[PDB]
């Protein structure tokens, strides 16, 4: 009955799934509200999707996230990519396009990935050296 689209973002192995609904305005992270997060200095990064477009958009939409994988700081990107898509999925389906297109071009000027998935994955460590490129120390004395 209620509008439900299962948006998800991804930075490295850190994945997050934002199940949006219609109601009062919840933006919870692992049960707790938006203002925890828990890196503590990077609380300001999680607001960036909210403060650009505005809090007026979230008055109808109710989001809640479960984050797993990666580390501490990598999971903040997973939340931020999930919430950014969470609006677009709602505004694409059941709202006019001109609002949703203003979200797109707003996030291009402050493009810290947001909608776009990041390219970098880890690369194998090959034999003979302490890393991929880094080789062992030689001696011919």
């Amino acid at each position: 009955t209620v509008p439900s689209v299962q948006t998800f973002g991804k930075k490295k192995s850190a994945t997050a799934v934002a199940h949006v609904k219609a109601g009062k305005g919840l933006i919870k992270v692992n049960g707790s509200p938006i203002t925890l997060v828990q890196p503590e200095i990077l609380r300001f990064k999680v607001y960036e999707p909210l403060l650009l477009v505005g809090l007026d958009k979230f008055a109808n939409i109710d989001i809640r996230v479960k984050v797993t994988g990666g580390g501490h700081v990598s999971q903040v990107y997973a939340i931020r990519q999930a919430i950014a898509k969470g609006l677009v999925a709602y505004h694409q389906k059941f709202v006019d396009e001109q609002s949703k297109n203003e979200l797109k071009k707003a996030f291009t000027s402050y493009d810290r990935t947001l909608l776009i998935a990041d390219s970098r994955r880890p690369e194998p460590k090959k034999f003979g050296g302490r890393g991929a490129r880094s080789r062992f120390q030689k001696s011919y004395r």
């Binding site: 692992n30 049960g31 707790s32 509200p33 925890l36 828990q38």
Partner: protein, 143 residues
């Protein structure tokens, strides 16, 4: 409203819980207090000295609330951390078992922890009351 444990911050949750226990002084004391290292690898004893156990017992109670059933060996592995084993790389080994066990044994008689099936320790009905009352008290401190 929606009064839950998650609205209160995790670090700030234990401060109100610690002072709540010290008023009564009915959580019980084992006997090994301040004759203690704290972990298997830790040069200095507890700096807090007095109190101390009431900080530990509060943080054990809130973790038993969130999860299904927590045990002794897992709590030692969770609290325990790094070492300095001479001139080698730093390893990880469990903390003190005797401290974390008597937290769980004493909290049963006070009225928080319950004996669960399969294995571990889950929460009682009266245990959820004291967790929410202190959470509601911490909500009043902020608001």
């Amino acid at each position: 409203p929606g009064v839950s444990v998650r609205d209160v911050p995790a670090q700030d949750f234990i401060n109100n819980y610690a002072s709540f226990l010290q008023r009564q002084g009915k959580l019980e004391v084992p006997g090994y207090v301040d004759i203690v290292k704290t972990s298997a690898g830790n040069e200095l004893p507890p700096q807090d000295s007095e109190g101390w156990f009431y900080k530990r017992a509060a943080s054990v109670a809130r973790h038993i609330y969130l999860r299904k059933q927590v045990g002794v060996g897992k709590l030692n592995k969770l609290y325990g951390g790094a070492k300095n084993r001479g001139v080698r790389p730093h390893k990880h080994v469990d903390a003190s078992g005797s401290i974390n066990r008597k937290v769980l044994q004493s909290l049963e008689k006070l009225g928080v922890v319950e004996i669960s099936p399969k294995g571990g320790r889950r929460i009682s009905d009266n245990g959820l009351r004291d967790l929410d009352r202190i959470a509601a008290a911490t909500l009043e401190d902020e608001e």
